[PDB]
């Protein structure tokens, strides 16, 4: 584990990460989909070999030596508010116990379900309070990865908060 286990958000490409692990926002079908989930193909196509997996789990496939984490958040033009809410957590506790598992000391990660996946909707908060309720109780350094610059300011906002 990381002799001061800390959260930090970078506004970039998951896939440049300077961490010892990723976790892919993916598919339930193991498919290349799109955003976050094409860029991981791109990057580390060989961790898509039976990368298929239900909404709500999480499931590691190795390219090379480099572990990827594929997590299904629930895609919420298809799921109720409660229900998906439900899937949303279930996936991040199953990230935890992945990387607990791998004896990583860092991981970079997306905000599930806040993509194509959200509905239409902002779920930035709902996202990331649900990434902290389940990595909190790591002491893997996690390392947050967004796209827009605005988001990158309220991720910031809110990991700061805390401390
Ligand atoms: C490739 C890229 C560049 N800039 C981006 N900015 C955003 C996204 C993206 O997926 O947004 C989903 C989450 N989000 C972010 C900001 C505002 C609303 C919202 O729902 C992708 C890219
Ligand atoms: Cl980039
Ligand atoms: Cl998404
Ligand atoms: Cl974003």
Same mark, same amino acid.
């Not at 194509?116 to 509905?119: A, L, P, Q, R, T």
């Given at each position: 584990g990381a002799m001061a286990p800390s959260y930090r958000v970078k506004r970039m490409d998951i896939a440049k990460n300077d961490e010892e692990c990723v976790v892919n926002a993916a598919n339930p079908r193991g498919l290349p989909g799109d955003? @976050?989930?094409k860029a991981v193909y791109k990057k580390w196509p060989e961790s898509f070999k039976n990368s298929a997996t239900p909404v709500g789990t999480a499931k590691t496939v190795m390219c090379g030596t480099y572990p990827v984490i594929h997590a299904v958040g629930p895609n919420f033009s298809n799921y109720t508010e409660s229900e998906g809410d439900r899937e949303l957590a279930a996936a991040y506790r199953e990230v935890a116990k992945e990387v607990t598992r791998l004896g990583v000391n860092s991981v970079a990660i997306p905000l599930?379900? #806040?993509g @194509?996946?959200?509905?239409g909707k902002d779920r930035l #908060?709902?996202?990331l309070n649900h990434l902290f309720t389940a990595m909190d109780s790591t002491d893997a350094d996690v390392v947050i990865y967004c796209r827009d610059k605005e988001w990158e300011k309220k991720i910031?906002?809110?990991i700061q908060?805390?401390?």
């Open positions: 955003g @976050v989930c599930l379900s #806040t @194509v996946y959200s509905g #908060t709902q996202s910031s906002e809110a908060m805390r401390t």
